[PDB]
CSV table of C-alpha atoms in Angstrom, one decimal:
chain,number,residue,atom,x,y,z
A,1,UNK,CA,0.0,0.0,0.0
A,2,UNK,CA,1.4,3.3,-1.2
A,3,UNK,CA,0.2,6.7,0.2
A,4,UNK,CA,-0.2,4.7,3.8
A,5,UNK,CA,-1.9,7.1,6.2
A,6,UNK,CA,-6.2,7.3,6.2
A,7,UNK,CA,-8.8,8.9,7.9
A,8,UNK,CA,-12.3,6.3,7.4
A,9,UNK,CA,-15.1,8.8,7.5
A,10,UNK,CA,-18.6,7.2,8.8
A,11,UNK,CA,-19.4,4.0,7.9
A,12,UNK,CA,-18.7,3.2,11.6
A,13,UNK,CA,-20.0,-0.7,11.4
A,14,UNK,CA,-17.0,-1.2,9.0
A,15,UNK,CA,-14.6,1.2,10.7
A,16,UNK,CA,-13.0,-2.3,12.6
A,17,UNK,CA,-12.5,-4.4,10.1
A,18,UNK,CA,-11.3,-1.4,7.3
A,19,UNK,CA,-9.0,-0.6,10.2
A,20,UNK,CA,-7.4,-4.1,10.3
A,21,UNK,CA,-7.1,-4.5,6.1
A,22,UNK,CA,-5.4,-1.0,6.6
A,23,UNK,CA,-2.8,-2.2,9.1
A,24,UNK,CA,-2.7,-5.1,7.0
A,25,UNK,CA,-1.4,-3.7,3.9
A,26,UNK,CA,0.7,-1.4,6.2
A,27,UNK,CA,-1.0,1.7,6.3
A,28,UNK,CA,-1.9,3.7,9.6
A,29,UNK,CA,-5.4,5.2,10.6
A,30,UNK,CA,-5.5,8.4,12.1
A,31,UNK,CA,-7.7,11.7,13.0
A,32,UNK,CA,-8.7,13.4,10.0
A,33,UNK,CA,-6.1,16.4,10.6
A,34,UNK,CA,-3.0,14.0,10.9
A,35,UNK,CA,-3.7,11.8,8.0
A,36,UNK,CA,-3.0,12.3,4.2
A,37,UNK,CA,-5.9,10.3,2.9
A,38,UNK,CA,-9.9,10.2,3.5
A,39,UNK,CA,-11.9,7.5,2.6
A,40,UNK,CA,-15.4,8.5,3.2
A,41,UNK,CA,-17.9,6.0,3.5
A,42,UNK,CA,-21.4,7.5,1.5
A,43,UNK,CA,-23.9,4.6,2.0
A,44,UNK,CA,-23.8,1.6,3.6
A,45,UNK,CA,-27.1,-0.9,2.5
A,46,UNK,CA,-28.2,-4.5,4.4
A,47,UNK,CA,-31.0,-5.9,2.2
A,48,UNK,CA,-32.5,-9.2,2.9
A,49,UNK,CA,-34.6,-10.9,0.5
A,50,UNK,CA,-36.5,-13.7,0.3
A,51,UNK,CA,-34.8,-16.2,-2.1
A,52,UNK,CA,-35.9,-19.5,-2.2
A,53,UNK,CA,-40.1,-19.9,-1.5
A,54,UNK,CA,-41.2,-23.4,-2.2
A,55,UNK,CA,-46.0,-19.3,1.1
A,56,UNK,CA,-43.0,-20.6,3.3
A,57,UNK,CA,-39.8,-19.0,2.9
A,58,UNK,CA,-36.6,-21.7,3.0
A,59,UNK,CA,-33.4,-19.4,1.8
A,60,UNK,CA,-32.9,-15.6,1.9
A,61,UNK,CA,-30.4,-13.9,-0.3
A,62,UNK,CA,-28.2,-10.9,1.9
A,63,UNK,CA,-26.8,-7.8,-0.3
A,64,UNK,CA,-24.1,-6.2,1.7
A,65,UNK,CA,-23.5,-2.6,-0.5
A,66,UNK,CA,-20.8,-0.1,0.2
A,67,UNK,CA,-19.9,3.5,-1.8
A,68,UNK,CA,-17.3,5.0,-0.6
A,69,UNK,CA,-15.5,7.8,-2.2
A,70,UNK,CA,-11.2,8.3,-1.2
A,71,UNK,CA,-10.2,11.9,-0.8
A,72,UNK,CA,-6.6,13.8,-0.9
A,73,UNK,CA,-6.3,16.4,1.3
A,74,UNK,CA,-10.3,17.7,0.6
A,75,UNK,CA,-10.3,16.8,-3.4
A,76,UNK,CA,-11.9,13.7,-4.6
A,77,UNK,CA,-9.7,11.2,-6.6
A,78,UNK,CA,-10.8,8.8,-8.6
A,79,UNK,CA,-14.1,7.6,-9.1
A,80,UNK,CA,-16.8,6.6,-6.1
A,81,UNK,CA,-16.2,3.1,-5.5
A,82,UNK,CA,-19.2,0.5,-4.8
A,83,UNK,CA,-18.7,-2.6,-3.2
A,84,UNK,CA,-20.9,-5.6,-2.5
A,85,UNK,CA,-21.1,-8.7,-1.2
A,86,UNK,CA,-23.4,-11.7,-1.6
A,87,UNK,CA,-24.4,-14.7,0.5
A,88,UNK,CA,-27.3,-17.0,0.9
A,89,UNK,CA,-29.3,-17.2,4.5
A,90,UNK,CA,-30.4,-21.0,5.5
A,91,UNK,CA,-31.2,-21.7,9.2
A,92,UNK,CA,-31.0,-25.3,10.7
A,93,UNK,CA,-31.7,-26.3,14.6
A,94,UNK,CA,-28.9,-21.9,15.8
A,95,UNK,CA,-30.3,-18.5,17.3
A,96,UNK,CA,-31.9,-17.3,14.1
A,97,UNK,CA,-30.9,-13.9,15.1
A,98,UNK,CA,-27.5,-14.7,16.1
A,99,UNK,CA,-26.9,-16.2,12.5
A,100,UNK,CA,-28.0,-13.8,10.1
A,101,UNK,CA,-25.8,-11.1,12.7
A,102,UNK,CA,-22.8,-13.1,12.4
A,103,UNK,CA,-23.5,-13.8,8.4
A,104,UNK,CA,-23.4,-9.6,8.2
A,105,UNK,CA,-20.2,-9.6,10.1
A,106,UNK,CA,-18.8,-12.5,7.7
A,107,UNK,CA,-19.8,-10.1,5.1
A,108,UNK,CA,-18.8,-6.5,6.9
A,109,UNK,CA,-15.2,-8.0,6.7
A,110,UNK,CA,-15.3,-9.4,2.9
A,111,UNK,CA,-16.0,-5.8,1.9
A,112,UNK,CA,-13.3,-4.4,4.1
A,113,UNK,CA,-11.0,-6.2,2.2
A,114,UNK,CA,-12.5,-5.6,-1.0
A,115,UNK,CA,-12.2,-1.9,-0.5
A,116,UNK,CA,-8.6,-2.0,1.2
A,117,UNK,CA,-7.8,-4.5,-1.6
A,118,UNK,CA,-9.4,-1.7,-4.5
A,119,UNK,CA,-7.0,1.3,-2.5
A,120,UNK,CA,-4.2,-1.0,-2.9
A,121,UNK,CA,-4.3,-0.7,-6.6
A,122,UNK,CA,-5.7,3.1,-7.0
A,123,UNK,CA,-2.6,4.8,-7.5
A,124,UNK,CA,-1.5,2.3,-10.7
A,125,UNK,CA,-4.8,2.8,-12.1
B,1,UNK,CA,-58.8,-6.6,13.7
B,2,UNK,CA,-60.9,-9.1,11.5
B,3,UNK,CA,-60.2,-12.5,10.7
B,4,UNK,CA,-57.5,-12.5,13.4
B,5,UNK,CA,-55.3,-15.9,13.7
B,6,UNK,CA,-51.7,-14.7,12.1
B,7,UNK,CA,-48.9,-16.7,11.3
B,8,UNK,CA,-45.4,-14.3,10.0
B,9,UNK,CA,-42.9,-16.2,8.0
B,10,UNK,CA,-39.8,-14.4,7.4
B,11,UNK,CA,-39.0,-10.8,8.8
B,12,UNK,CA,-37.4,-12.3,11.8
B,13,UNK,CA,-36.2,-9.3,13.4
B,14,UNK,CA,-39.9,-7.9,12.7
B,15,UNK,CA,-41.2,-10.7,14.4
B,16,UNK,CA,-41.5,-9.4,18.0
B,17,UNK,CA,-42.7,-5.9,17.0
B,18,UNK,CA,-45.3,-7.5,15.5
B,19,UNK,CA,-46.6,-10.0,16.9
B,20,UNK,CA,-46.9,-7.4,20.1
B,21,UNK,CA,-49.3,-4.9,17.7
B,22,UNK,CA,-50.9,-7.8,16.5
B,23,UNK,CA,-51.9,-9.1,20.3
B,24,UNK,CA,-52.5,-5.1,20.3
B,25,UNK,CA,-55.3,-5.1,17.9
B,26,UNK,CA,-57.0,-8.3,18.9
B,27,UNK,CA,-55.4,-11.0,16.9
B,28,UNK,CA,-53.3,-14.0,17.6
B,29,UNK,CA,-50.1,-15.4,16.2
B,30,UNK,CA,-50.0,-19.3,15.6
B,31,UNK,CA,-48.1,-21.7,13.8
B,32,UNK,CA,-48.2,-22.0,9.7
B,33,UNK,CA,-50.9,-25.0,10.4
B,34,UNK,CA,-53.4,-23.3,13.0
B,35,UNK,CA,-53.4,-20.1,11.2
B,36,UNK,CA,-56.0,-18.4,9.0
B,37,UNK,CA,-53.7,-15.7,7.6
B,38,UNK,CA,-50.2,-15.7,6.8
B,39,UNK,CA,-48.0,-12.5,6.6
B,40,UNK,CA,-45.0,-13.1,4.1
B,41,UNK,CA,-42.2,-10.5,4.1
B,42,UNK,CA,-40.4,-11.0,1.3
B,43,UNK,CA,-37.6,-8.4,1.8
B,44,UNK,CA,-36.2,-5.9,4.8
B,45,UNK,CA,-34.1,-3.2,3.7
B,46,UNK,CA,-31.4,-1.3,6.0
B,47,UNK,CA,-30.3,2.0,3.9
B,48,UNK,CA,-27.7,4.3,5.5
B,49,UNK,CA,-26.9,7.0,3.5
B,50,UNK,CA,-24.8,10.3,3.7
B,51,UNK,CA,-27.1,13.3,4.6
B,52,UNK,CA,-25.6,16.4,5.7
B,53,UNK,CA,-21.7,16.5,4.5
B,54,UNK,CA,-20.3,20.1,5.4
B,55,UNK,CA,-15.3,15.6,3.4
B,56,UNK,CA,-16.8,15.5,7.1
B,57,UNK,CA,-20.3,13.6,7.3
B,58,UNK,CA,-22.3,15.6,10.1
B,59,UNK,CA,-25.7,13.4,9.4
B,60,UNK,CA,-26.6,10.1,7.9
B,61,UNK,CA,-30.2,9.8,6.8
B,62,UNK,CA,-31.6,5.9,7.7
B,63,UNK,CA,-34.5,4.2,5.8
B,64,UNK,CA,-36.1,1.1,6.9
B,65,UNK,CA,-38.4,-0.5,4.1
B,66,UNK,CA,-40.2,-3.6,4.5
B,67,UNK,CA,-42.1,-5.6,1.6
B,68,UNK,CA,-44.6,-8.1,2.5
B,69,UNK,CA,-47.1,-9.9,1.2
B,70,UNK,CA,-50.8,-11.5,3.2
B,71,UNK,CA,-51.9,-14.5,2.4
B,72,UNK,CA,-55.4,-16.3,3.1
B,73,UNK,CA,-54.5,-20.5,3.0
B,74,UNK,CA,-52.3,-20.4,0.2
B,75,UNK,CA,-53.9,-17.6,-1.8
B,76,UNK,CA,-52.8,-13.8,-2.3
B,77,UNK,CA,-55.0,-11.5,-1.2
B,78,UNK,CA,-54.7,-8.1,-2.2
B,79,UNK,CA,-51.6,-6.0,-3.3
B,80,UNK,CA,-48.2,-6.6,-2.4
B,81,UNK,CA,-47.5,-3.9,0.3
B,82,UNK,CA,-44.2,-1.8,1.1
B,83,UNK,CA,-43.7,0.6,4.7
B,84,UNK,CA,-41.2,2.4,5.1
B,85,UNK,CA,-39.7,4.5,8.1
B,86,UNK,CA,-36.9,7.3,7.8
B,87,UNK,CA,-35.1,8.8,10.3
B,88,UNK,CA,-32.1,11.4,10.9
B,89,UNK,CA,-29.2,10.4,13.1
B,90,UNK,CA,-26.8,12.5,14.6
B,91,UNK,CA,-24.5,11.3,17.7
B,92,UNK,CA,-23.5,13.7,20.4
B,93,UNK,CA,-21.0,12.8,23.2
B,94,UNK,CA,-23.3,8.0,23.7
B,95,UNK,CA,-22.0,4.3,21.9
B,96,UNK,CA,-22.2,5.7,18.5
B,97,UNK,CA,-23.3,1.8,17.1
B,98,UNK,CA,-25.4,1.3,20.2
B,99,UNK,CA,-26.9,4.4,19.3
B,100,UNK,CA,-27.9,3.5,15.4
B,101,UNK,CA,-29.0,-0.3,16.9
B,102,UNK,CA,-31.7,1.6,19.1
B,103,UNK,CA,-32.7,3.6,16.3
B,104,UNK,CA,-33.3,0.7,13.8
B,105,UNK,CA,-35.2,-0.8,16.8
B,106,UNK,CA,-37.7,2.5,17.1
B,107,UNK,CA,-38.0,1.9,13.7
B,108,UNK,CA,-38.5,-1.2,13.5
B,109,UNK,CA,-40.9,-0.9,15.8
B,110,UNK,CA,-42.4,1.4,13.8
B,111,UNK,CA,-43.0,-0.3,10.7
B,112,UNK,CA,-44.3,-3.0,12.7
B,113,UNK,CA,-47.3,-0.4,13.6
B,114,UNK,CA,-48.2,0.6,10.3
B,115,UNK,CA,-48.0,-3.1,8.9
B,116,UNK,CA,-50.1,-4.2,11.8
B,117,UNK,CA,-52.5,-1.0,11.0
B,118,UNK,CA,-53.1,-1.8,7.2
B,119,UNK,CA,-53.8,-5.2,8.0
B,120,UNK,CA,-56.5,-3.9,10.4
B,121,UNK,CA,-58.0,-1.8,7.2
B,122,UNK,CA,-57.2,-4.3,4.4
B,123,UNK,CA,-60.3,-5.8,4.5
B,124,UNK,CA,-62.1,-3.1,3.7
B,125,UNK,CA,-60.3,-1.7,0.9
């Protein structure tokens, strides 16, 4: 990762995970006055559908969407970014609740490191 | 409430909410076999979005929007209906995700109302 220090601007459920990719690629996070780099998070979306029927539901499909725009120094660079990630819902006997939460954490993380992944190739392109 | 034994498949984190304004209007909830009607949702939608900006979100704006369907034994009966709730939120100094989790719960809640109130009027439209 080139250009290493970020600022993540809302998109607080994802600020965790971003933070870790950051790290990862050996970037730091910071406040937004000592960093060089903003990426600011402009809509985060959790849709749950219902997939598979068979008047009683069996399977739900999960849409995990994320647009985030990076910034440098208060310009915009590049193009807004969207993200999403995909995954089917099936409960057996569990904590129904419990699942589908962890499934959206599963997926929280995938699109951290789809983003971190995208910054780590925005300079080249 | 008319014709009130209810079963709700899907919607799981709708369940409570409704199932309490369902007891509220006179109804029951039973299982898919020893119910009359059947309330499908067939998608729950969690949009958070950027609102007020000022590089430096101040606001988000949060929509809720749940799709569901009744059903009398097997059979469609009237229009598919949507609900949706909208809300502003804005932290102060707090638990800035403990915060938006109560808010999707008050709307939540919410929704629940309305869906529970158009069922009371469906059917006499």
């Amino acid at each position: 990762l080139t250009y290493r220090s970020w600022h993540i601007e809302g998109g607080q459920a994802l600020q965790f995970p971003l933070e870790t990719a950051l790290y990862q690629a050996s970037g730091r996070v910071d406040d937004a006055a000592g960093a060089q780099m903003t990426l600011r998070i402009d809509s985060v979306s959790q849709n749950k559908e219902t997939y598979t029927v068979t008047a009683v539901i069996n399977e739900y499909l999960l849409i995990l969407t994320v647009e985030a725009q990076v910034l440098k120094r208060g310009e915009p660079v590049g193009k807004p970014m969207t993200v999403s990630v995909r995954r089917v819902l099936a409960y057996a006997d569990l904590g129904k609740q419990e699942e589908e939460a962890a499934l959206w954490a599963e997926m929280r993380q995938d699109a951290a490191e789809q983003i971190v992944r995208r910054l780590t190739f925005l300079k080249a392109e």
